[PDB]
């Protein structure tokens with residue numbers, strides 16, 4: 654009895670735009686996703702791959718209904734909706750606090766449960782080099798941390814918040830290969846039964862997906878197999 658529970662996603666007549674009365678990048682988009690399913694979102698450049706991820710996070714002017722595990726996005730807080738998602742890549746917002754608060758903002762885990770997730774995402778050697786380890790306060794954003802380590806923190810932060818839908822926007826080209834490998838390893842351990850929406854521009858970068866979505870013109874066509882995509 655928790656939310657999000659499985660990662661089932663249902664989109665119905667979704668229309669996204671960047672300004673009030675602007676051009677509809679996506680119009681009347683509707684599909685559905687099974688819990689824990691690896692979904693590949695295919696689309697050429699400028700087709701609207703990034704726009705669909707921004708529409709999921711209510712970061713644009715969106716009309717239509719999206720629901721996760723039966724819970725509509727009109728039925729919870731905006732902050733509680735985005736917490737169900739894990740977003741990579743992104744401009745990582747580092748809290749003005751310790752490594753612990755940045756990894757466990759809600760203070761729901763012990764330092765043993767945090768260090769184990771930190772070891773999986775490859776942040777073990779990055780935290781141990783600071784005096785106090787998890788108690789090292791991160792100030793001025795996270796300037797002491799690399800850009801790739803910030804995304805590992807965002808990845809580890811998503812695991813500790815128990816997100817069920819992981820959004821990946823062209824990780825094969827817009828992430829360091831080391832970072833992509835660590836995420837793919839997380840998808841077989843902590844994120845083993847979580848929904849992953851893989852957005853790429855070439856089919857070769859989304860072979861391991863069970864289902865596929867193609868952004869043809871301003872529509873989204875659905876395919877349940879790679880055979881004749």
Ligand SMILES: Nc1ncnc2c1ncn2[C@@H]1O[C@H](COP(=O)(O)OP(=O)(O)OP(=O)(O)O)[C@@H](O)[C@H]1O
Pocket residue numbers: 671678696697698699700701702703704705
């Ligand atoms: N701030 C923005 N404001 C208005 N329109 C935008 C904005 N960002 C993207 N778009 C428009 O929305 C369309 C698709 O945008 P989007 O960036 O999501 O496609 P994309 O698949 O991510 O392409 P790419 O990643 O190669 O840049 C484009 O026609 C683009 O002009």
Ligand SMILES: [Mg+2]
Pocket residue numbers: 702703
């Ligand atoms: Mg993009």
